mmCIF file of C-alpha atoms and ligand atoms in Angstrom:
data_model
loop_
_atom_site.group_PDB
_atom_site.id
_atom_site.type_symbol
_atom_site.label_atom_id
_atom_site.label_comp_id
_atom_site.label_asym_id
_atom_site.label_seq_id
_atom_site.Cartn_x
_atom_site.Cartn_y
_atom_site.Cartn_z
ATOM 1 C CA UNK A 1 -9.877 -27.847 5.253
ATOM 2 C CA UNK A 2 -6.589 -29.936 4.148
ATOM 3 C CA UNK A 3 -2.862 -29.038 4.959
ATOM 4 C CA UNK A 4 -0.854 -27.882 8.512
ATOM 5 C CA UNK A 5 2.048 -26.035 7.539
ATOM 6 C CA UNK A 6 4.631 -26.169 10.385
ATOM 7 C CA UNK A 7 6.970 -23.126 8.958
ATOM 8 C CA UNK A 8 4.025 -20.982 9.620
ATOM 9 C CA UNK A 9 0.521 -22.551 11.850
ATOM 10 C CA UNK A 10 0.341 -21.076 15.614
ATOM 11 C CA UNK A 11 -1.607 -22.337 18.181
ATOM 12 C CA UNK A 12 -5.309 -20.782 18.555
ATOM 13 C CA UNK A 13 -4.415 -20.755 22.164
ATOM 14 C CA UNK A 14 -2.104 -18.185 22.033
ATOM 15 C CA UNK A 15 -4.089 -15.564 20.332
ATOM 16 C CA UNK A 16 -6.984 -13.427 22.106
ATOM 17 C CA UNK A 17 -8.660 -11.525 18.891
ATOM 18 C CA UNK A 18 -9.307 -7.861 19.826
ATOM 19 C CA UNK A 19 -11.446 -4.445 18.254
ATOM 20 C CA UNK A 20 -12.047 -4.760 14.503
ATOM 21 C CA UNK A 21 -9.558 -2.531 11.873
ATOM 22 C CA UNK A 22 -11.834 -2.351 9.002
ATOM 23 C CA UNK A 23 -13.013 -3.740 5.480
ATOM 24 C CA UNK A 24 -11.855 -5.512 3.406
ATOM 25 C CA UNK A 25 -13.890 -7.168 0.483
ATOM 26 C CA UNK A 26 -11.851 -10.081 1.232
ATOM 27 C CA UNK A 27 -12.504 -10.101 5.249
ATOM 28 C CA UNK A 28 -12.854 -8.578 8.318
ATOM 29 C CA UNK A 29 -9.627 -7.329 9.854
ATOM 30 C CA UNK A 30 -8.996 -7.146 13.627
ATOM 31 C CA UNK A 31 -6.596 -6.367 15.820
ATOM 32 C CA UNK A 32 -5.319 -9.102 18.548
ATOM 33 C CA UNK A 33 -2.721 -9.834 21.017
ATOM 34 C CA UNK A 34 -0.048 -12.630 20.244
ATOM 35 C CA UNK A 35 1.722 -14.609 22.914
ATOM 36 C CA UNK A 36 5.539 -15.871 21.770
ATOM 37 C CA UNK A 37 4.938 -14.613 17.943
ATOM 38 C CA UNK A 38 9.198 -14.405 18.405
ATOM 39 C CA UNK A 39 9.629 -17.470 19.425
ATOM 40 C CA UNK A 40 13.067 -16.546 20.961
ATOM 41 C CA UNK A 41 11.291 -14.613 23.881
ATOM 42 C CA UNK A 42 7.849 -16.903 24.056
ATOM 43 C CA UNK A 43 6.870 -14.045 26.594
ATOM 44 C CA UNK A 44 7.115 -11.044 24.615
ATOM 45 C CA UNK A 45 3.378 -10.286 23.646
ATOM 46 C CA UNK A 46 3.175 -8.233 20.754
ATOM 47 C CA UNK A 47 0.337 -6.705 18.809
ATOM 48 C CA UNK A 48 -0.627 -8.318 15.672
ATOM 49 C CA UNK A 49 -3.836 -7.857 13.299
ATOM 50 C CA UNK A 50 -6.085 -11.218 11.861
ATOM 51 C CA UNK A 51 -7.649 -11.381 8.936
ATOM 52 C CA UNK A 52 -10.614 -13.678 9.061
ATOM 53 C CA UNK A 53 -13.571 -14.284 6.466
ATOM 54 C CA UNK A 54 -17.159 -12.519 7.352
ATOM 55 C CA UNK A 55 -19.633 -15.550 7.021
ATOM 56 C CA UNK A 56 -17.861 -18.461 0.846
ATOM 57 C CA UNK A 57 -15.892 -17.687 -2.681
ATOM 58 C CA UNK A 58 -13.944 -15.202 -0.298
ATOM 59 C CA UNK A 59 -12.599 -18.431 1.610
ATOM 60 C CA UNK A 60 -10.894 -19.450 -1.986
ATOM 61 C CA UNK A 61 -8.824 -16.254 -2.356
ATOM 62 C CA UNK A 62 -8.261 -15.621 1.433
ATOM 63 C CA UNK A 63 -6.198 -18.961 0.793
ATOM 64 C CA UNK A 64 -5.047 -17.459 -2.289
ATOM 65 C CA UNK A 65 -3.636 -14.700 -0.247
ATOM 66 C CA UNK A 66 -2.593 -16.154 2.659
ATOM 67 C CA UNK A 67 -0.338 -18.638 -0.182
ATOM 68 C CA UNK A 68 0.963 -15.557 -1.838
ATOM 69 C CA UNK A 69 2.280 -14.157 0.999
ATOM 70 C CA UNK A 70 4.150 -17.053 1.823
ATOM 71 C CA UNK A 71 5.819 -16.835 -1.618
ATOM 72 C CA UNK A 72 7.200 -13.436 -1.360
ATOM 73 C CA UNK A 73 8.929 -13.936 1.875
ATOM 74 C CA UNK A 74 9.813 -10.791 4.154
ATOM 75 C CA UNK A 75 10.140 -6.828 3.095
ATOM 76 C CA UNK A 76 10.452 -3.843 5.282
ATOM 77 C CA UNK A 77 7.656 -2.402 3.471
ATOM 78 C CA UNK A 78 4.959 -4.360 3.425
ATOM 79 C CA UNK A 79 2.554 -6.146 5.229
ATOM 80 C CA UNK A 80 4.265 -8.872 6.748
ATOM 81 C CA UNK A 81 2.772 -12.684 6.981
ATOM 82 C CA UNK A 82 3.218 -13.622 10.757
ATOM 83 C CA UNK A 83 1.813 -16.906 11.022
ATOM 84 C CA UNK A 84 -1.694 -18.965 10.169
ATOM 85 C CA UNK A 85 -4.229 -20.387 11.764
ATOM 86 C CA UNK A 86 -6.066 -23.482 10.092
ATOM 87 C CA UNK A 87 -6.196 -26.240 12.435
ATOM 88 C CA UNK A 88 -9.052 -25.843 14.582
ATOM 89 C CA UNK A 89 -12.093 -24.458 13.001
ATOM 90 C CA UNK A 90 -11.831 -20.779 11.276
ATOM 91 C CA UNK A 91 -9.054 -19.828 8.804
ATOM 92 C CA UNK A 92 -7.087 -16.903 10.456
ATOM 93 C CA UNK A 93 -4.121 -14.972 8.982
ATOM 94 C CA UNK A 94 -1.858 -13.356 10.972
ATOM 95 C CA UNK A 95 -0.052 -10.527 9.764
ATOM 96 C CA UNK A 96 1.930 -7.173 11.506
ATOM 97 C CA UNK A 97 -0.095 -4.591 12.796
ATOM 98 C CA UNK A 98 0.390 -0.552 11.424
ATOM 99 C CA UNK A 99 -0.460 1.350 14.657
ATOM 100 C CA UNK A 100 -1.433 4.492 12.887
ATOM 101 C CA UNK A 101 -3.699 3.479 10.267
ATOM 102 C CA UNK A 102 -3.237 4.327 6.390
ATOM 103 C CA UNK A 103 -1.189 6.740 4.967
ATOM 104 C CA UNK A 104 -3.780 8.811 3.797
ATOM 105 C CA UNK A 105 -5.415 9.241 7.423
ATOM 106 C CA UNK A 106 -2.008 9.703 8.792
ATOM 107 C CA UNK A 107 -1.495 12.645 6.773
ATOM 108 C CA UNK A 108 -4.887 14.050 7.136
ATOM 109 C CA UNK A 109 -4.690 13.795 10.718
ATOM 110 C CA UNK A 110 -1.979 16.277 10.950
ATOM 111 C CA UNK A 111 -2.454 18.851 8.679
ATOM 112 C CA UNK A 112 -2.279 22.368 9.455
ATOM 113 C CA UNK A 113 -4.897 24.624 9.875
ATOM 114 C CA UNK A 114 -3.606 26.051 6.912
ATOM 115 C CA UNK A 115 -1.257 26.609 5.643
ATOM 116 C CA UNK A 116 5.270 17.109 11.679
ATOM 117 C CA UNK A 117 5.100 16.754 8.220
ATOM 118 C CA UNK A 118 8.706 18.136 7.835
ATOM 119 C CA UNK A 119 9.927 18.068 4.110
ATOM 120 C CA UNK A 120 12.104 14.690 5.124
ATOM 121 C CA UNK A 121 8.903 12.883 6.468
ATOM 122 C CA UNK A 122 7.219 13.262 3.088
ATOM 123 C CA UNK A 123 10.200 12.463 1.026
ATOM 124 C CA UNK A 124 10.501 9.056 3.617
ATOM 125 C CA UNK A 125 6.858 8.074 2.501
ATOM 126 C CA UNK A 126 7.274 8.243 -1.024
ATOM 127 C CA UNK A 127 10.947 6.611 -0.832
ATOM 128 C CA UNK A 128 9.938 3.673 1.003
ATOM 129 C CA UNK A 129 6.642 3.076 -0.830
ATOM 130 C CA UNK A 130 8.589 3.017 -3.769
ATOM 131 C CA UNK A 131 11.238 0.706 -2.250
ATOM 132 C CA UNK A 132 8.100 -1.660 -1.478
ATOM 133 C CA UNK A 133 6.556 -1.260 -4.716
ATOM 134 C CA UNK A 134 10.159 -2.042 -6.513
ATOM 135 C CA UNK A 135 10.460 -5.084 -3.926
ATOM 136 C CA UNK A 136 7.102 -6.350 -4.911
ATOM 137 C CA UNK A 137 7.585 -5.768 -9.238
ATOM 138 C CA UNK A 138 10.914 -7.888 -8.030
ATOM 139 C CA UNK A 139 8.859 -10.797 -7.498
ATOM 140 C CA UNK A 140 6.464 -10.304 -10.180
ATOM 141 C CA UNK A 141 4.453 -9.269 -7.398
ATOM 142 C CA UNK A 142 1.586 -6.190 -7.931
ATOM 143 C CA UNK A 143 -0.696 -4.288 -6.680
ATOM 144 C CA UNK A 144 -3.263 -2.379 -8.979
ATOM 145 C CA UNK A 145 -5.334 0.019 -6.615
ATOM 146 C CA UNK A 146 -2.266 1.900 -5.213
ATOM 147 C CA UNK A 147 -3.391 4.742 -3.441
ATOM 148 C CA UNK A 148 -2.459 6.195 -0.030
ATOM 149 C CA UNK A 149 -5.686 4.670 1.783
ATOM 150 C CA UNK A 150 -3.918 1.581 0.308
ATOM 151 C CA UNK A 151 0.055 1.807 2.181
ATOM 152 C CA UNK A 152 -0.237 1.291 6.096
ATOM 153 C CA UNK A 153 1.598 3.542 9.084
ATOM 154 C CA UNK A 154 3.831 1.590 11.556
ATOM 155 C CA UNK A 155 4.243 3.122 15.019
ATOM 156 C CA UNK A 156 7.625 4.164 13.686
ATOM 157 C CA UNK A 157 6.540 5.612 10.510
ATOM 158 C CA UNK A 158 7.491 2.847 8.343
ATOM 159 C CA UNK A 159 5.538 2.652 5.291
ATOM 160 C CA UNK A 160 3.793 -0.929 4.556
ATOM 161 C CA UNK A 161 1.779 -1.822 1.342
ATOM 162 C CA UNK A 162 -0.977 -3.791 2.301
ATOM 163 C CA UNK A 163 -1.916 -6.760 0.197
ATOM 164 C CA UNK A 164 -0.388 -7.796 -2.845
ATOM 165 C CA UNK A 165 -0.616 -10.767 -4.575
ATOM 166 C CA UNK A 166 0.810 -12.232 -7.816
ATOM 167 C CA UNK A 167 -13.673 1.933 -9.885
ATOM 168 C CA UNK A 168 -10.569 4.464 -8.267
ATOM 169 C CA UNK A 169 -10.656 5.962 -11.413
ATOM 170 C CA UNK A 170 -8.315 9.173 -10.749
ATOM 171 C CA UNK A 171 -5.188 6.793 -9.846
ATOM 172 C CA UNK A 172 -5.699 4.516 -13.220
ATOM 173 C CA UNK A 173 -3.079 4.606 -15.994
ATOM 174 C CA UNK A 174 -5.214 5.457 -19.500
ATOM 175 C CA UNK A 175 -4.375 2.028 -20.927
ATOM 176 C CA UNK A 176 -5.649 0.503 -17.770
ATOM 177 C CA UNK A 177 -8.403 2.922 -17.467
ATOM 178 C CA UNK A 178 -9.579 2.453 -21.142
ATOM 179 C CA UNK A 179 -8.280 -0.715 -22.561
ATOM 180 C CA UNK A 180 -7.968 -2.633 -19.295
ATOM 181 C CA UNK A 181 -4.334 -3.712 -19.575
ATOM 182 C CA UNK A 182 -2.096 -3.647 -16.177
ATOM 183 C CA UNK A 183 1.584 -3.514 -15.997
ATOM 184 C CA UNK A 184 4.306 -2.474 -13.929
ATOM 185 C CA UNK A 185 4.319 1.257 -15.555
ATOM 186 C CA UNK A 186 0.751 1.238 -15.177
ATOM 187 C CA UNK A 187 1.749 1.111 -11.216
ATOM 188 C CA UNK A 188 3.943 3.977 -11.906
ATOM 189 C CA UNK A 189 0.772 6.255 -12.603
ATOM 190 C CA UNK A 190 -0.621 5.647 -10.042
ATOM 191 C CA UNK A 191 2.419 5.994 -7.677
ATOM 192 C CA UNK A 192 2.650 9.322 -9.377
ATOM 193 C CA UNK A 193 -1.104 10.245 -8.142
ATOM 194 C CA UNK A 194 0.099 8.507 -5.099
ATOM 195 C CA UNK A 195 3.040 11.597 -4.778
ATOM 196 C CA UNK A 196 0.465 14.059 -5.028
ATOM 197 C CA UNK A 197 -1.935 12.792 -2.334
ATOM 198 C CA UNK A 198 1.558 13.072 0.130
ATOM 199 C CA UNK A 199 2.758 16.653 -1.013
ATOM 200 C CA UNK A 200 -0.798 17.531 -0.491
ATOM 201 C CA UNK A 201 -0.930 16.016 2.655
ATOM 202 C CA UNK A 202 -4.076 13.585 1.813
ATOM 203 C CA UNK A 203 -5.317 15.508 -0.762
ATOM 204 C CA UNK A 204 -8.246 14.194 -3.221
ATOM 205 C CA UNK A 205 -7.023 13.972 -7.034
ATOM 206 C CA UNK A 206 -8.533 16.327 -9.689
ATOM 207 C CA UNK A 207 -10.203 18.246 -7.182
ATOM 208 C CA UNK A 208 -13.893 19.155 -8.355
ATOM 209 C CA UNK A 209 -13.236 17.260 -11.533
ATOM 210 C CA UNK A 210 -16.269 14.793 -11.597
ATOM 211 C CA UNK A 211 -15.099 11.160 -11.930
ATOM 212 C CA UNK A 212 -16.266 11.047 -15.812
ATOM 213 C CA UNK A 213 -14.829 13.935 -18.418
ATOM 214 C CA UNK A 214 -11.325 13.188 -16.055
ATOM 215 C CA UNK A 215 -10.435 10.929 -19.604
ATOM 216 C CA UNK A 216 -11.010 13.756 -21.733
ATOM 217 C CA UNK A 217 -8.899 16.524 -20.380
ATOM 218 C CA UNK A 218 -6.202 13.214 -19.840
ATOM 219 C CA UNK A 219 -6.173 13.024 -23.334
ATOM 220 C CA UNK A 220 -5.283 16.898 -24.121
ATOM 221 C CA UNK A 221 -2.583 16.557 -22.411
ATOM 222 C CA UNK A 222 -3.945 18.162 -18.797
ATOM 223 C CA UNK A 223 -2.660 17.176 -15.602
ATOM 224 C CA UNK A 224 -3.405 18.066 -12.023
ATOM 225 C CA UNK A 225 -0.824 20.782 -11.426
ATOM 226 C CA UNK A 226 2.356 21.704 -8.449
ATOM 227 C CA UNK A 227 1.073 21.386 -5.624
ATOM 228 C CA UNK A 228 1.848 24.316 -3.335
ATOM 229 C CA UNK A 229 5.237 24.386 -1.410
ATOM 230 C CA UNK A 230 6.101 20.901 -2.979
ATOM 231 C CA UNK A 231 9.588 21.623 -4.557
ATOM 232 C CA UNK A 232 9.955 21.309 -8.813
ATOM 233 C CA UNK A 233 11.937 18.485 -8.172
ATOM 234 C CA UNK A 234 9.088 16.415 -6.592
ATOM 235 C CA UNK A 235 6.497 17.876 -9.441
ATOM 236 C CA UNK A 236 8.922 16.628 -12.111
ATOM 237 C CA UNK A 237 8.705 12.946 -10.511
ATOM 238 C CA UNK A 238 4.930 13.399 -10.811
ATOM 239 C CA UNK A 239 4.800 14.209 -13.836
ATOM 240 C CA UNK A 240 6.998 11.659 -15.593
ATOM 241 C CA UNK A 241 5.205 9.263 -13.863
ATOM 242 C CA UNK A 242 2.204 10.682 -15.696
ATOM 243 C CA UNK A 243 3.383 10.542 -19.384
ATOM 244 C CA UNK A 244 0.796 8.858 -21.845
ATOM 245 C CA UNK A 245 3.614 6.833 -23.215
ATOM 246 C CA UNK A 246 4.129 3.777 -20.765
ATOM 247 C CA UNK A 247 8.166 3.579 -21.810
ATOM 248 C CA UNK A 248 8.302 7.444 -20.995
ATOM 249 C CA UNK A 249 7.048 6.755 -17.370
ATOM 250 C CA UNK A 250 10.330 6.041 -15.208
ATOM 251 C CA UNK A 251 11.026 2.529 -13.613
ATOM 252 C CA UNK A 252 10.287 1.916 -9.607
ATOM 253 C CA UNK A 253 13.608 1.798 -9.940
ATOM 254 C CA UNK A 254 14.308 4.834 -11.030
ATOM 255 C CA UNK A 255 11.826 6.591 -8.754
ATOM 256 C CA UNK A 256 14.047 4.768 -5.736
ATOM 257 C CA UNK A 257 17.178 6.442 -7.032
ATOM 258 C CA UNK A 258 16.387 9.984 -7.945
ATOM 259 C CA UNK A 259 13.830 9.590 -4.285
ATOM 260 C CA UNK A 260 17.164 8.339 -2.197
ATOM 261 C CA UNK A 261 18.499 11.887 -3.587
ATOM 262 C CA UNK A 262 16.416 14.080 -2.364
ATOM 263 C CA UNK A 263 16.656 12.042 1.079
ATOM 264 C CA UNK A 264 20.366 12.418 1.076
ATOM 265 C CA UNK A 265 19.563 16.230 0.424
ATOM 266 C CA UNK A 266 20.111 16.641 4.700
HETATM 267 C C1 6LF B 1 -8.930 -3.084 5.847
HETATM 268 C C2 6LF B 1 -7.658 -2.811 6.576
HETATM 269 O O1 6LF B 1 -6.750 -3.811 6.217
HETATM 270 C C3 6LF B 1 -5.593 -4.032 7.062
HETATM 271 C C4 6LF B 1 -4.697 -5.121 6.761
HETATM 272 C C5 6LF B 1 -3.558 -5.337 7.582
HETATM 273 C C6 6LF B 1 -3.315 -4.483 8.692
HETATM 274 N N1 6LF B 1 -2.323 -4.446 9.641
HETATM 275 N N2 6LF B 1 -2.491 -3.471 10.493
HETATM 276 C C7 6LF B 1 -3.598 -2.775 10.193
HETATM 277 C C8 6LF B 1 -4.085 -1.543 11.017
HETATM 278 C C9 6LF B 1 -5.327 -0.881 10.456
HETATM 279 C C10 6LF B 1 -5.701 0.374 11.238
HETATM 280 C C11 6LF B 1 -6.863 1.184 11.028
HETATM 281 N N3 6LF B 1 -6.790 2.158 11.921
HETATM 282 N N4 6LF B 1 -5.726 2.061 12.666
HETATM 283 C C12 6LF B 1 -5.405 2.992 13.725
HETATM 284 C C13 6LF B 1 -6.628 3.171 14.588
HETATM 285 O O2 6LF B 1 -7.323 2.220 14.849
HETATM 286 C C14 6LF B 1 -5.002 0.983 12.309
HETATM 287 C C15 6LF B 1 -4.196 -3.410 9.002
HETATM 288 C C16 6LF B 1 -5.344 -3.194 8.166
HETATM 289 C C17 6LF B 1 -7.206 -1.387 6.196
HETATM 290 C C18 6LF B 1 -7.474 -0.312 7.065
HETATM 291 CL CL1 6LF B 1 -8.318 -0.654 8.564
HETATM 292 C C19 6LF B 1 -7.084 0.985 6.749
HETATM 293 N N5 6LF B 1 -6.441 1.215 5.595
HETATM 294 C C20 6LF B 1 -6.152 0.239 4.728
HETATM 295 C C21 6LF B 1 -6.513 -1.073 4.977
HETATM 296 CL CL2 6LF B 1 -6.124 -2.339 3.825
#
């Protein structure tokens, strides 16, 4: 409908849409091709993904979205806003491309037999989803559902949170899960769950644990235990992250620092 927003509309012309990527609630998802998306070399195709609505209430927040990411400028680690398309017919949102799929695929897809994945790979995931979780509590940014199907996989293994703005029961924080309050240390539960999917490589939470009588043994104190050959260190992260007390969780902040030291660990 109304405005043409010349820091970010591209031409229609210039963008062939390609095989679909998935979901999501909002809209379908598919990759395409981009000609001059850098407009230094305008003949340096590149590979970008579009998010489009289905065919709408959806059209309201895929505007909503397309605004916030405007707002929150750049960040190696996440989704990226590439440019928009609103001038000639259907609203499309360009944004970067992760070649190999979400996190939790990526790490499924290369498991052992049983029992890559080096030790420094997994510590890289977790250190640079927390740098883009920190980036996005920076501007009062947030993103509830955090969950490894929920951080994307660049060709070069750069971790990207996808969608932000300003039901998965087993990565809720109690006072979420029960009194339906959300904040920043509420993201640090799940982050913790989050660690445990990657030292598992992929793993499902609470395994066997139907998704019900999970609050109960929450409340005694239980918690999903080391996983094997992931170091104390990392298990101590975890479970800080999944103290009752929000204050007694550690900042993003925090899990960036004492994440960069096991990284420097080399
Ligand atoms: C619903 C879909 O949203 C997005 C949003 C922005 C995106 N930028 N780039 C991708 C690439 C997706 C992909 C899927 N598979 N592969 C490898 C093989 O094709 C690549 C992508 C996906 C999704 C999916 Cl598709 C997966 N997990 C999370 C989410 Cl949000």
């Amino acid at each position: 409908d109304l405005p043409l927003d010349p820091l970010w509309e591209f031409p229609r012309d210039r963008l062939v849409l390609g095989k679909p990527l998935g979901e999501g609630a909002f809209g379908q998802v598919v990759r395409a091709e981009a000609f001059g998306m850098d407009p230094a070399r305008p003949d340096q195709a590149s590979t970008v993904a579009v998010k489009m609505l289905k065919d709408d209430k959806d059209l309201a927040d895929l505007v909503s979205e397309m605004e916030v990411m405007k707002l929150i400028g750049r960040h190696k680690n996440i989704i990226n806003l590439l440019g928009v398309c609103t001038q000639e017919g259907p609203l499309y949102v360009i944004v970067e491309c992760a070649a190999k799929g979400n996190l939790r695929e990526f790490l499924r897809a290369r498991r052992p037999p049983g029992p890559p994945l080096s030790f420094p790979v997994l510590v890289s995931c977790a250190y640079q989803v927390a740098r883009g979780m920190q980036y996005l509590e920076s501007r009062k940014c947030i993103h509830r559902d955090l969950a490894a199907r929920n951080v994307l996989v660049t060709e070069d293994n750069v971790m990207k949170i996808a969608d932000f703005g300003l039901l998965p029961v087993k990565w809720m924080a109690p006072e979420a899960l029960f009194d339906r309050v959300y904040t920043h240390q509420s993201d640090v539960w799940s982050f913790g769950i989050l660690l445990w999917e990657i030292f598992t490589l992929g793993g499902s939470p609470y395994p066997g644990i139907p998704v019900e009588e999970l609050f109960s043994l929450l409340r005694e104190g239980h918690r999903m235990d080391r996983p094997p050959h992931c170091p104390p260190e990392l298990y101590g992260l975890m479970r800080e992250c999944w103290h009752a007390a929000p204050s007694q969780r550690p900042t993003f902040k925090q899990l960036v620092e004492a994440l960069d030291k096991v990284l420097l660990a080399v």
